[PDB]
Design a protein around this ligand. Structure first.
Ligand SMILES: Nc1ncnc2c1ncn2[C@@H]1O[C@H](COP(=O)(O)OP(=O)(O)O)[C@@H](O)[C@H]1O
Ligand SMILES: [Mg+2]
Lengths: 50, 857
């Protein structure tokens, strides 16, 4: 979206394959961070005192 | 007759009556005894079958004339069941007489709208029919063209349905000869968009109409510039900001008007004297005959009352939000242009001596400047070495005309920009629908550079239609691995376009010679003759006629041969101007003239801009899914109901509608993606394609189709899109809707079942309670009739049972209350415990935050 208009961008094979790689990297990083948050939530039980 | 009742007034004008089709079925007919035969004055005539001697079938025409002709040009008539057919793809026999005669049959019943395959055809009725009522527009909402009578409203509705469903842009393109009705249909499309800011778009079209259109031989409401109106929509599927783009307003109209051609609408709307305030502040009477620029035309149209048009455009300006100051400014400029038209000049020893400067003073007052400075700039032009130059008397008139037309063009662009600003709204807009209405094809008695540009635009639009409907569809058939023989339908206008558009071509030679100084019509024309005469099929020697004006050459568009006399096209394309008057106008007092015109000297030929605009527009269009409307003018005399056969035949041949219907009925019109088809039509056989049990598109779609018990030869499975034979998609939609209705009805039945189940369980519990109550009251009566029971059973509970039986009741109720209190207290203690755990959680978070600020330092 440029301004208030959703303009479709035209890209060659190199850009689309690099975009696929970037999507894979980002989703796997979010995977890892979600796993870390989940294990932290499970371990962080009551009375984390002192 | 649900459609009849819903439509009301427009029902007889859009759909054939039930009795009409009933009597049509009873019309005498046979496989033989019915034929169409060619004729000279009328293209085709109905005829009977008499005898086939040596293969020469003899036909007795409906007029009684009888002639025998060979099997050539002998075509069987279609059965009466196809009379006045809504969509013209289901004709069992397709042939050139058939399209004309079905069109004429519908026209006689005033059924202008007809579907020819995928796109639509509209015949000019030359009479405003009651079909555009808002009730009909509402009736045309969310309806397929199959289930509704043909109409431009249905076309817009189908475009909007695609808009919503496939989330892709649409482009409604109107194509046809001038005066066929493209502008009217564009207005109707905008009306349909407005019904379903709306007043802004409604009134924007008349605002530009009052300044752009002019009365011509071909049509009185003749547009002189192409319109592209883009209506944007958000994701929710609602109207949003709009946009309007103009293409090559014919600036030569102000300087000169043909003998039978009027000038622009506004120049006589203001002079109609509907508002004498305009006359007073413009210092102009109500008689245009005193004013040279606008007195060349008739200045009078039988069907046009300039007072009504003036009040309508004033109302539109008010609705759009036009402030009084800018309206007065453009009125003053419009006065100034024919004030310039009043200029007269004389040679006296060399620059022409100014005279009659009072009108020049009035014009300078209207625009705002020193009149002497403007006079000297016109009398003694100064250009880039500001150096004075001797020039002829006749040239000052041409310079004034060029300045007036440039001012008019800038004012037009200012109106366009103001319309964009008023219509633009910051609300989100996802996609857009583009309505295209170019200046239609026209053949004037004398034609010039602007006529050539308009006809070239029409040529390119027709070529785009040919390329998309014929070439690209067949290439799509081929690419998806579908067996299909290549068919050439016989129209490829790329050669005709390349005759002028491509470099070294006639238009290209025009820009090249425009760049060349000292360019003359005689030599340049020569540069055309040695380049493409003879060797180019379209271009040829002028077929000069004594009645018509002398023409330099004649060239063949898709719509026929047209003569094109060149008279100073070089100056028109170059657009020279006097820099002194340019500087004077730049610093004018008026806001409009100062801001607009200051960029002239703050070159590119207008023909090059025209070509670039066409290329950009059609490249943008290729990204869209066009819906085509083809407009046919029945008679040149503007007589409603007169259906002139040869003209319509020529228009049908040039348009190539017949080949479009052929490629619609023969090839596969409907193409749907495998995944889209699966997610859409899974309801037909939910057992096939099990819910999330595999991964495959082609196999699942093939199983689904093979389970649909239809003609499996209709569809040819492709790589990514499964194709559909004509008429199949609507059938599948019909069974999908029927299956959905069945599912909903079964859902209602199940819901009723469960509601009854719960209410009857409640009835069971109520009946058990009633049995308990009745048994207890029966026992109470049985013990109450006993005299003994009451005496020792009504006072014991109060007194004798209080101390050692009712005390169990007291201890039980106090136990219940104490237990409730204890449970509430323990629950409060537990929630306070978890709350203080949360307080620990947030306090350690806050110590982490404190560590964060120590990190910040
Ligand atoms: N659908 C229609 N209903 C009524 N009149 C129509 C219709 N289409 C065209 N006309 C008439 O035909 C003439 C030309 O139509 P118009 O849209 O102005 O043509 P163009 O687009 O070529 O300028 C006008 O007299 C107009 O009123
Ligand atoms: Mg028009």
């Amino acid at each position: 979206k440029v301004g208030n208009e959703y303009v479709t961008k035209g890209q060659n094979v190199q850009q689309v394959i690099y975009a696929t790689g970037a999507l894979a990297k980002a989703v796997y990083e979010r995977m890892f961070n979600w796993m870390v948050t989940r294990i932290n939530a499970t371990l962080e039980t009551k009375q984390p005192r002192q | 007759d649900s459609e009849m009742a819903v439509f009301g007034a427009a029902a007889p004008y859009l759909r054939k009556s039930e009795k009409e089709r009933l009597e049509a079925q009873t019309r005498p007919f046979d496989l033989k005894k019915d034929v169409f035969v060619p004729d000279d004055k009328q293209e085709f005539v109905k005829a009977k079958i008499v005898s086939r001697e040596g293969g020469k079938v003899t036909a007795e025409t409906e007029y009684g004339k009888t002639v025998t002709v060979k099997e050539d040009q002998v075509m069987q008539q279609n059965p009466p069941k196809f009379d006045k057919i809504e969509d013209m793809a289901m004709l069992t026999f397709l042939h050139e007489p058939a399209v004309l005669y079905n069109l004429k049959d519908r026209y006689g019943s005033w059924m202008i709208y007809t579907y020819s395959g995928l796109f639509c055809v509209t015949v000019n009725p030359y009479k405003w029919l009651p079909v555009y009522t808002p009730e009909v527009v509402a009736a045309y909402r969310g309806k397929k063209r199959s289930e509704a009578p043909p109409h431009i409203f249905s076309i817009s509705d189908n475009a909007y349905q695609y808009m919503l469903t496939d989330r892709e842009n649409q482009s409604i393109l109107i194509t046809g000869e001038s005066g066929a009705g493209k502008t009217v249909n564009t207005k109707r499309v905008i009306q349909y968009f407005a019904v379903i800011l709306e007043d802004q778009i409604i009134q924007a079209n008349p605002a530009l109409e009052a300044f752009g259109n002019a009365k011509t031989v071909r049509n009185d409401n003749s547009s002189r510039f192409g319109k592209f109106i883009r209506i944007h929509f958000g994701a929710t599927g609602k109207l949003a900001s709009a946009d309007i783009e103009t293409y090559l307003l014919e600036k030569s109209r102000v300087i000169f008007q043909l003998k039978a051609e009027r000038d622009y609408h506004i120049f006589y709307q203001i002079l109609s004297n509907k508002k004498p305030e305009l006359l007073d502040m413009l210092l102009i009477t109500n008689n245009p005959y005193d004013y040279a620029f606008i007195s060349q035309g008739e200045t009078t149209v039988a069907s046009i009352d300039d007072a009504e048009e003036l009040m309508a455009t004033d109302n539109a300006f008010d609705v759009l939000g036009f402030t009084s100051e800018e309206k007065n400014s453009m009125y003053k400029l419009t006065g100034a242009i024919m004030h310039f038209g009043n200029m007269k000049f004389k040679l006296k020893q060399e620059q022409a001596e100014p005279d009659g400067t009072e009108e020049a003073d009035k014009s300078a007052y209207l625009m705002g400047l020193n009149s002497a400075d403007l006079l000297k700039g016109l009398c003694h032009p100064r250009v880039k070495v500001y150096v004075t130059k001797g020039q002829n008397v006749q040239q000052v008139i041409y310079a004034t005309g060029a300045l007036a037309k440039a001012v008019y063009e800038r004012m037009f662009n200012w109106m366009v920009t103001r319309i964009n600003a008023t219509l633009e709204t910051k609300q989100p807009r996802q996609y857009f629908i583009g309505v295209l209405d170019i200046a239609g094809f026209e053949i004037f008695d004398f034609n010039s550079f602007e006529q050539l540009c308009i006809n070239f635009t029409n040529e390119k639009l027709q070529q785009f239609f040919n390329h998309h409907m014929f070439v690209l569809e067949q290439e799509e058939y081929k690419k998806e691995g579908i067996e299909w023989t290549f068919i050439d339908f016989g129209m490829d206008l790329q050669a005709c376009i390349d005759l002028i558009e491509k470099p070294m071509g006639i238009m290209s030679i025009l820009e090249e010679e425009c760049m060349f100084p000292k360019a003359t019509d005689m030599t340049f024309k020569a540069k055309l003759f040695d380049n493409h005469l003879g060797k180019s099929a379209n271009f040829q020697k002028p077929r000069n006629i004594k009645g018509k004006p002398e023409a330099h050459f004649s060239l063949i568009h898709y719509a026929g041969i047209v003569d094109y006399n060149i008279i100073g096209w070089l100056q028109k394309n170059k657009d020279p101007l006097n820099e002194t008057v340019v500087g004077l106008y730049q610093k004018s007092s008026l806001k409009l003239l100062s801001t607009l015109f200051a960029n002239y000297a703050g070159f590119q030929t207008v023909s090059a801009l025209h070509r670039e605009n066409l290329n950009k527009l059609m490249t943008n269009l290729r990204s869209t899914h066009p819906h085509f409307v083809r407009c046919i003018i029945p008679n040149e005399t503007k007589s409603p109901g007169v259906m002139d056969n040869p003209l319509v035949m020529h228009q049908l041949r040039c348009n190539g509608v017949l080949e479009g219907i052929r490629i619609c009925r023969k090839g596969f019109p409907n193409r749907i993606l495998y995944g889209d088809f699966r997610q859409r039509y899974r309801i037909l056989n939910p057992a096939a394609i099990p819910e999330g049990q595999f991964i495959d598109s082609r196999k699942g779609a093939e199983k689904l189709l093979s389970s649909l018990d239809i003609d499996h030869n209709q569809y040819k499975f492709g790589h990514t899109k499964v194709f559909f034979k004509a008429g199949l998609l609507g059938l599948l939609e019909e069974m999908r809707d029927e299956r959905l209705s069945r599912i909903i009805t079964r859902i209602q039945a199940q819901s009723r079942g469960v509601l009854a189940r719960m209410e009857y369980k409640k009835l069971l519990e109520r009946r058990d309670s009633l049995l308990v109550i009745q048994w207890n009251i029966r026992a109470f009566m049985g013990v109450k009739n006993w005299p003994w029971m009451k005496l020792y059973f009504k006072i014991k509970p109060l007194l004798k049972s209080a101390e050692r039986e009712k005390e169990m009741a007291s201890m039980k109720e106090e136990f219940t209350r104490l237990k409730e209190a204890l449970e509430k207290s323990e629950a409060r203690r537990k929630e306070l415990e978890e709350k203080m755990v949360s307080l620990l959680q947030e306090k350690n978070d806050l110590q982490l935050q404190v560590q964060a600020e120590q990190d910040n330092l």
